Each structure stands twice: as structure tokens, then as C-alpha cells.
Amino acid sequence: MASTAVMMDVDSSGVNDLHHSEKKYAEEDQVQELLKVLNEISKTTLTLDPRYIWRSLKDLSSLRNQELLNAETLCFKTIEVTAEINCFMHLLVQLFLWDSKELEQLVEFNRKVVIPNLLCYYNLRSLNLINAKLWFYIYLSHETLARSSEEINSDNQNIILRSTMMKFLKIASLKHDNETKAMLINLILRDFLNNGEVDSASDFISKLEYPHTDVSSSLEARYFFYLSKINAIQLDYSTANEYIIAAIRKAPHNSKSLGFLQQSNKLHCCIQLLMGDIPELSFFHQSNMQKSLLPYYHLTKAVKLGDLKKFTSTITKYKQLLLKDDTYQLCVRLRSNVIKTGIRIISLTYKKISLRDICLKLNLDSEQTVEYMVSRAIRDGVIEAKINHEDGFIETTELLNIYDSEDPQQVFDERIKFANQLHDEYLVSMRYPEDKKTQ
Amino acid sequence: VKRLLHVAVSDSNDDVRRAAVIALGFVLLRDYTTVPRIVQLLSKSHNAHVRCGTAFALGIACAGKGLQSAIDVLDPLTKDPVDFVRQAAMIALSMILIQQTEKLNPQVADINKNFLSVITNKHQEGLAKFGACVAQGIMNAGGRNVTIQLENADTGTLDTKSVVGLVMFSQFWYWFPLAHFLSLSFTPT
Amino acid sequence: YFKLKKLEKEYELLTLQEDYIKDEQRHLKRELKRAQEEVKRIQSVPLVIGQFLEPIDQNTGIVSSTTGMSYVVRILSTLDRELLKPSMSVALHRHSNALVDILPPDSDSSISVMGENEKPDVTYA
């Protein structure tokens, strides 16, 4: 029972014992695997009263009991080292709100776990056995504050934490000191997304991606996730989406697809908006609103027309939901964009239309702001036309070519450049059986 | 080495390669270590001479040493269709295999047998049988109680003379009246 | 710092040990590709005719000769199985004497042939 609970952890420690003698890939991925199966046993009734007794005994095990806080009494230096650390890993696991509610207790514990005899020698030894999420995933909760008077001061524990993560960013020595890292960024990112202005993300950019391989595509996507949101008000759209496009593409998430990928999708949906593309939410009908899309759809629904009021109405309606996702900042722009979009379409299809007939769409809307409004539109390209008011003729271009240009062959080049994608990758993985079969 | 490699690797003439391949195990002497892993590349070849050239340089570096690993590399090459090829492999291994025998190294029997096998075999060549009988008597040289040493960890120091006999004998089926040079590295236990 | 000096140092050897190989390869690459060539040119025109009888196995079989010779020979390593065709007029070296290739079906022997009007000239009516 607690036995079997312990027995599982015995296997974990037994697999920790694998890593203990130089064997992570087993251990970590097992620990990874263990992290999931961790939900099973969970709790910590006799698992720990039997753990703190099974392993060995250490001062910190005592200070850990301050987190335990209970009564058992009863009767009943090596193996009890990183196991204890690996259990401090599970300590954090005992903190999930699994076996906890207020980790603000555990906050200090975390430090008092993190900082002492830990966050010390571990550079290549601990391999992302740090979970700074599960470090912060704790603090994540409490950042429901509100309450804290943030934090302490303002809010320095987080500033500290940032600096502490910074204190890791040093510790990210790239000795392999990586994996967990840009969660730190991601934290800081979402910390920006909490308050700060990401743009130092550019510095965070400037450092790195979570290099590289063994990082969870999840994070690597979650990397992109915020990293998308960089370009959000960085107002790069593709790349933002490309992140999403590199995030949802192969980030592995079903359980976490649920609330969390919606988020992704939300901004993702928000992307094509940035481009005014309005894909068919005909899919985004599905696994969406419910709780995510449909305002986006309403947006799309509006953005299909981009009818400012009807547009605004959605916003008018969903602003809080927007506000809930802070996609509100968006769309304030695509308003006239779609207006200008329509302006472009089923309309520019003459080599003109007039001033006033194209002004008619503005005679539908406004006048001689047209001049601006058209220049407003022409300004961006995003249409191609000309005018002369001296002509009063809003002169709407071809947009007509052939592939005479290198334009296709650009794409061919684009295709060409990709010729190495799977081709060079085949060699990227050629190794593994081929090389391990030698073993 | 790297030069020597590609030089060997690239070159038209085999025995060049072969010898160049062979010559490797000298500049490569001090580490026999990866030499098998090295010649493992050339353990495989389209070309025997390659696979010929292999045997020596490897069989050289471990002559006074171990690595059944290195050895066992060559055992298929002891079966490499050309007796001349394996003829080396016979010798080459036996160069390693004096004093090492008998459940310390069991396979020696086979090896010795394989000689005898070959030596008995009428259809194994006097390429094969030759090297075998030699490789046999190699293991048996100086009443079999004597060893083969170069860059002698006893001293830690090279013996040019230890080298020479090989290099001498290197060309032989070229010029048969040679191998007697091989007596150099013969070393007392 | 130190035992690396022992330890660490030794691994540039591996660095090197790695390095060599591609070289060998590129050669070997070329090696095939140059060797690869004549492998084709093994084939050549001044061949003889026979009738494929039957494979003994892949790149083996009994066939016919226009001399009636039927012997264990070789065939296309070009073809395989589904590629290999169980009775065929065939292409044989004289001396290497092996199957160079099938002959897409022969027709006109005796018999005394067949009517062949390919696109007849007559419209009806």
C-alpha cells in the first residue's frame, strides 16, 4: 500500500540508482515516466513516514517534516543523498496541490530545498532534475495574488526568483546547463505577460531557444507559445504563428491540449486575424469555443465582413473574454483592415473604380478621409491601386504576372532550401540504430 | 596517419594501401587501442589487399598485447577467401598470440587447429599453410617461451630492432628469403 | 582541472578518430561510383539468344541457348523476383554466358507468323 506506494518509489529510486551510477536516459525519462505515474500513489501518509525511515536520515529530512507537519512517533549518507534530492524532487511533487494547497509554506521550503545542498554542484550531474516549473509552478499558483502585496516588496521574491532564475541563467553555463531554462524565460515571459514588456525577450532571444534537443517539445512549443506572443505586439505575425506553427505542429499535448492548447489556438486564431486571413473556423467550430474560439469566430464572423460596429460588437461583447486572454489589444486594427480588405476585393477589379464609387464604399463610410483612408490603405500596400483626385479616379491595379519571374523559383528555392530538411535529417538520425547496433 | 590513410585510402595500387595500411600500425603502434575500431573500417573493404594490409598493422600493435576483440576482427578475415589474405591474418594474429593461449585464450586451439586445419587441408594454399605453419611456429618460436615486444613498457622505450623484422618481412611473397628478420622482437619470458 | 589532463586530453584522439572517416567515405563514395560504372558496362550488345527456362534462385537459373545450351548461369541482378520473368527469350553473354536480360516477347517464328495489319487501311462501307 504505502508499501506499494513506497515500492513504486523504490523502483524510482531503483531507477534513480540507475542514474546514481551514471544512467539518466533511463532515470530522467523514467523520472519523466515516473512523473506521470506519480499521480497514482500520490499523497504522503506512510509513503514518507516510511520514506524518511526507508532511505536514511538527514537534517533536511527533518526540516522537510515542517512541510509534513504531523504525528507518527511509532518505533521502527550515500543511498540517502540524491534520492533525498530526487525525493526533494518528489517533495515538489508532494507540492502540486497534490499533497498540498498553500505552497507559500512550500515557497520557502522550495528555496530551502532549492538553495541548500541543491542549486549547488549539479551542473552536469543533475540533468534538469530541477523542475523550475515545479519550482515556480508552486509560485505560479500563489501569483493568484492579488493578496500578497506583491510579494514581499515589489515583488522581489519573483524579482529574486527572476534574479534566481537569473542566478540559474548564470548556472545555465551551457555545460548542458539548459533544459529547464527558458521556462525561466517563459516564466519571465509570462512574467512580462503578467506585467513586464517582453522586449528583453530579445535578449532572451539573444541567448537561446532552450538548446536544444532533450527539452520537451512541450516547453519548446511553450517556448514558442510565449515566443509567439512576443511577435504578438512585436507585430510579427507569421513568425508568431510560425512559433504556434512550430508549437502546435509537434509539441505533443492532449491532456494539456485541453485548456492550454486552446490558449495557443486562441492567439493562433488571433494570428490570421493579424493577417486578416480568417481561416475556416469551420474546424475551429471544434475544440474551441465552447470556451475559446467563437469570439474569435465572432471576430472572424465580423472580420469576414470586418464591420466595425458588428466588429466592435463582438469586442463590445467579448472584451472581458478578450481581456481574459488579453487578445483585446488585437483587432483594434484589423477593424479597418478588413474594411480596407473589402475595399480591395470584388472592387479593385476594375483598373480603377472612381474616386466616388470607391469613395462610395466610403460614401458608405467617410469622405476625403478617403484620400487618407485610401492612402491609409495604399500606404500599407495590402492593396495595389492608385488614384488621381485631380482625376478623381481611384485606379486599381492589375496584380497580374506570370512565373516568368524567379518568384516560383524562389518557392522552388524555398523548396530547394527544404531539400535538406528531411534529406539532411535522414543523416541526422541515420546514427541511432546503425550506431547503437554496433553496441 | 591521416595523410597515410587517404593516401592509402585513395591510392590506385593496393599494396601501397595495404602497406600504407600496414605502415599505420607503427605510427599507430603506441595505441593499438582504436586500431581494431580503426581497421574495422578497413576490415571491410571491397579489396583484400586493404583487408590484407589491415591484418598486420593491427596484428602488429597488439602483437605483444591482447584484444581478442582485435583478433576476432580478423578471424573472418582469416576466412577472407584469399589464403594470402588470411595467410597474414594467421600470422598477424599469431603475432599477437604467443604466450596468451589456453583458456586464457581458448581460441588459440582453433587458431592452431585452423593452421593445422589449413596445414592439413590440401586445398588451403601454401599461402595459407605457409603462414599457418609459420604462424604456428610463430607461436612456437624459440621454444614458444619467448615473446614479441616493441616500445617496451618494461623500459617504456622503443626498439628499432623490434620493428625491423616485420618491415623486413613485410614484402615476402615478393621476396621470399626474408622472414628470418622476424627474430628481432623475440623476447624472453 | 587535472585528471581531465590525463582524461580530457585523450579524447581529441577520438575527435581525430572521428575525423578520418568521412574522408574514407568520400573516397569510398567515389569508389563505388567509379566502380559502379563498368558494373553497367558488364552488359553489352553482341549477345546470343536463348529461352529462359527457370530460376534455380535469384541470379541463377536454367535457360535455353539458341544453341540449345542450358546451364546454370547468372541473370540480371537488375531484376529481382517480380522483376524476374519465369520464361523468356533471353540475353546471354557468350563466355560469361549468363543472362544479360530478357527479350520482350519474340513473335515471328514458325509457325509461319501471324497476320499483322496495324491500323488496317480499309474503312467499312
Binding site: 551542473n123 552536469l124 553555463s173 555545460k175 548542458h176 543523416l427 541515420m430 546514427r431 546503425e434 550506431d435 554496433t438 | 573500417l41 571491410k44 | 582541472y1 581531465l4 589532463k5 582524461l7 580530457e8 579524447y11 581529441e12 577520438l14 575527435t15 578518430q17 572521428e18 572517416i21 568521412k22 574514407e24 567515405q25 569510398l28 563514395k29 569508389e31 563505388l32
Partner: peptide
């Protein structure tokens, strides 16, 4: 120091495409 240390990891990581080309030499 640890300077000297993970310098290996490069070589350590290097070890490999190598062994592909190893398979490649084979594959050739």
C-alpha cells in the same frame, strides 16, 4: 577547471555522425 571538464561533451557529442558515416562506409 570545469572549463577543462565538459570540453569532452563536444567530443562526446561528436562521436556520432561519425558512426553514421561508419554505417555509411558500410552502406557504401
Amino acid at each position: 577547471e570545469q572549463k577543462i571538464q565538459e570540453t569532452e561533451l563536444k567530443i562526446r557529442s561528436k562521436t556520432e555522425n561519425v558512426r553514421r558515416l561508419e554505417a555509411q562506409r558500410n552502406a557504401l
